[PDB]
Amino acid sequence: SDVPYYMQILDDKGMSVQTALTWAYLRPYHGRICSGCHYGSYRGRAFKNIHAKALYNWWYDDRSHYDSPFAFRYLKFDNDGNYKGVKHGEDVVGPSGTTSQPVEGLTLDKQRTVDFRRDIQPILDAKCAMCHDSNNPPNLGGGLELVSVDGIAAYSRAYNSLLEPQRGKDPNIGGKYVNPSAAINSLLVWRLYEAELSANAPREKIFPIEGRLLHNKFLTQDERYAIVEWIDLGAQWDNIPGPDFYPGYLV
């Protein structure tokens, strides 16, 4: 509470179908209800009468403030890569008995994010850069070495490649390989899962009929979903606030 946040509804592969773009905040001990996902219950429409299963998971105990579960750190998937469930992290916790559920995700120090330099780039170096060089776009090689563009060196070759715009496409939607805050709309993810994930096609020619190579088995589930999370988060580069030890802009 007392921190800015928003939400994303997810499908059975763990990808965001719709993102709520705004900043929501809860006061301490407060709780907030909404009929739907931008349904208009908080804008122009009356609350729809709905008998929900979640209502009984909220507060059922008189010795507690709230009996609702805290946000889980990780996910569990099956062998198919489909959603199995939710998974507890290391941050679990005076404390008193004022809630039934385990206390998770209240430590700001330990809150997890996906950083391109720390997380994604090593995966790219290990499983990708071998077959992707200047002669085979996108160019994922070069490691974390910064690339100067118009007199400014910020990011690496792989980041510059993956975030590249596409002709005839609104960059607010996405680029060639990446759609920020939609992984399901991203060509990169389309190829990593080797399937058509959404009803919005990134381009006209997606899967080559000649010389095609299946990319779905190159990564484990953790790596691939790390990329998914990275894209859904807005596909940043430096996700650690303030100057850090990881490669970046310096003068």
Binding site: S134, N135, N136, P137, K205
Partner: protein
């Protein structure tokens, strides 16, 4: 001297071509109206002599050691051999019609001469030891303008500029074999003035124009009649042929002619004869565009009149009629030969 195709005399040299010694100390200018070749010292930028050759030289090539200069005399239908140190022509070898260009093999043992006569298809080979014309390699069509030899020296490309043809092509020759392996057509092209190789030998650049012949002649806007283009061809088997624009919407490069390739393949230099300027392009952005685009997308991008600004480094003011350009071996200087102004423009490149 005489103005080309005329009996009218002029005192002006009229430089048609330029090249440089592999050690970069000397420039050799072929004077079309002067019937001679001007020697210039690179460091002092001073004329160190003028060597008389046969009628109307349009081209010259230097031996790897730099002891000899092979000049193409177009009207004389011949090739002069010049001693560089003696500043004297020691022989005249006779070739097919209008040699428009000549180049020496990497080993320096062979010279290749493109015979550009409109009804002539030939590339004449010349042994440097015999100083004589061995045989002729017949191209796929008429009018080879210029040749170029690959860095590995096992392949020879020839631009065929063929009169009365909308589709003008490029021939690939196997030097050891001495025959045509493949012919690649540049669709809707005319006036191919040059061909160059990339240092890695994976691409060739060809300057030309795109006419719209099947359309009424009505306006000058949006390149309704002529557009000016540079084409990058991938030397691999089944490689892409990418026709790319040289023009802005309201600014066009008239009649692109001469080309100079950066030694490391960083930049491309294009003499623009009609617009009297040197167009410098970024070759990694160009080749980057070629690698990342399909054939369809490139074919659509040929008519994009805003596309140049992506890969365009500069357009540099020159004298009148810069028909030819050349580079120093370090690539820090570009020289452009100006016919009407009778001079050479010296340009400091982006390389540092």
């Amino acid at each position: 001297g005489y103005i080309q195709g005329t009996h009218v005399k002029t005192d002006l040299p009229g430089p048609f071509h330029i090249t440089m010694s592999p050690d970069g100390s000397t420039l050799f200018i072929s004077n079309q109206s002067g019937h001679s070749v001007t020697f210039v010292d690179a460091r002092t930028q001073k004329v160190t002599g003028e060597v008389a050759v046969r009628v109307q030289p349009e081209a010259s090539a230097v031996t790897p050691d730099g002891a000899f200069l092979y000049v193409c005399n177009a009207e004389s239908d011949s090739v002069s051999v010049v001693d560089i140190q003696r500043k004297q022509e020691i022989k005249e070898i006779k070739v097919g019609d209008w040699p428009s260009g000549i180049k020496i093999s990497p080993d320096g043992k062979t010279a290749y001469v493109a015979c550009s006569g409109c009804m002539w298809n030939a590339i004449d080979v010349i042994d440097t030891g015999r100083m004589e014309k061995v045989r002729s390699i017949y191209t796929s069509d008429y009018g080879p303008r210029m040749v170029e030899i690959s860095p590995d020296g096992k392949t020879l490309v020839a631009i065929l500029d063929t009169v009365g043809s909308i589709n003008r092509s490029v021939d690939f020759i196997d030097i050891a074999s001495g025959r045509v392996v493949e012919n690649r057509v540049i669709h809707e092209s005319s006036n191919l003035r040059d061909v160059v190789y990339t240092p890695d030998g994976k691409y060739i650049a060809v300057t030309h124009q795109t006419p719209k012949n099947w359309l009424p002649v009505c306006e000058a806007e949006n390149g309704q009649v002529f557009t000016n283009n540079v084409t990058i061809i991938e030397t691999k088997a089944g490689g892409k042929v990418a026709r790319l624009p040289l023009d802005d919407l309201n600014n066009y490069d008239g009649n692109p002619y001469g080309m100079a390739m950066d030694p490391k393949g960083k930049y491309l230099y294009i003499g623009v004869r009609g617009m009297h300027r040197v167009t410098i392009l970024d070759m990694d952005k160009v080749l980057g565009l070629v690698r990342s685009s399909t054939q369809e997308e490139l074919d659509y991008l040929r008519d994009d009149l805003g596309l140049v600004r992506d890969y365009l480094v500069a357009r540099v003011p020159t004298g009148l009629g810069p028909s030819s350009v050349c580079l120093s071996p370090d690539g820090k200087f570009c020289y452009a030969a100006n016919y009407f102004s009778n001079n050479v423009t010296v340009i400091r490149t982006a390389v540092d």
